[PDB]
Amino acid sequence: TTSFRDKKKFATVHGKQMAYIEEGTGDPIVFLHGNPMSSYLWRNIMPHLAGKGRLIAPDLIGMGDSDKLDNSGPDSYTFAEHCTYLFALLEQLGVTENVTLVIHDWGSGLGFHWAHTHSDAVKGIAFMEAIVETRESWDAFPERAREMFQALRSPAGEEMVLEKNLFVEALVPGSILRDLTEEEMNEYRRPFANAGEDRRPTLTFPRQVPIEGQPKDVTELVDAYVDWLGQTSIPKLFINADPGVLITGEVRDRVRSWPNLTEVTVAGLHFIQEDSPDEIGAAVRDWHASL
């Protein structure tokens, strides 16, 4: 049988190898994962778009089968650095026009920021469990994740992630309704199997979430793209999750005010691709076909 790792192509980006799935021809349909996942997150959704365009699912730097950075430490794998690598990869792959984005979690921070700064290049944005606000208070943070994220953002974070791999080992199964199979879980573990800095991307990401204005750079760029999303006529497909995690309550009401928006609801907590892949794939296919 052909494994997932086996299907990947590779590009040299600032001297580092970045892995990605690419299949088909036509305008790009770009699938962006977040933390602590990889292109594997899209494996059951991509077949619903087969023959509809050029499907591209990159592994972010330090994740999936992409290279790890050199002398990784607490300043490594920030949002800015992820932009540097991903945006360069996208340019190298000729993702420049008529782009459909299918985005989740930190992949949505990256994708929304890309769309905002390449606003004439975008055919449509499908998003789910996405970065769609900055939080003025920890009170606004998801109840089920607050203790975990407060501890990750503290000095405790290195031991929790670099040693104990808790983003993978606790947050992943906690954020899926079903149980992943052993094979599926082992594929998420694989890029992070080695203790130490190999796991750093999964710790810098929670430290980059904009809460009480910190970090400042991420807060500003998210605020900027959220303002723009409330105005732009670019078609939007909001895949709402029931119950969801990141997009719930008041946040969800605000998303529903965005222009040119189609909404579908599917079962899921946060990694909803694992609970409702066929519902998500069919929704993306049908919406993309209507554009």
Q: Give the interface with Cl ion as residue ranges (CB under 5 A).
A: 35, 205-206
Choose, from 33, 48, 104, 270, the residue flagged as catalytic. 270
With respect to Cl ion, which residue has the nearer C-beta, 106 or 258? 106
3-state secondary structure at position 102 = strand
With respect to Cl ion, which residue has the nearer C-beta, 35 or 134? 35
Cis peptide before 215 (omega within 30 of 0): yes
Distance in angstroms (rounded) separating the CA atoms of residues 27 and 200: 34
Sheet containing 122-130: give its strands across.
Answer: 9-13, 16-23, 54-58, 28-32, 99-104, 122-130, 236-243, 261-268
Strand duo 99-104 + 54-58: pairing: unpaired
The least distance separating Cl ion from the CB of residue 230, rounded to whole angstroms, comes to 24
Choose, from 105, 187, 274, 275, the residue flagged as catalytic. 105
Chain position whose Cβ is nearest to Cl ion:
205
The least distance separating Cl ion from the CB of residue 209, rounded to whole angstroms, comes to 6
Active-site residue, 113 included: no
With respect to Cl ion, which residue has the nearer C-beta, 248 or 262? 248
Choose, from 59, 67, 81, 129, the residue flagged as catalytic. 129
Active-site residue, 6 included: no
Cis peptide before 243 (omega within 30 of 0): yes
First to last CA, the chain: 36
Active-site residue, 143 included: no
Kindly report the length of the chain: 291
With respect to Cl ion, which residue has the nearer C-beta, 124 or 206? 206
The least distance separating Cl ion from the CB of residue 205, rounded to whole angstroms, comes to 4
For the annotated catalytic residues, the residue numbers are: 105, 129, 270
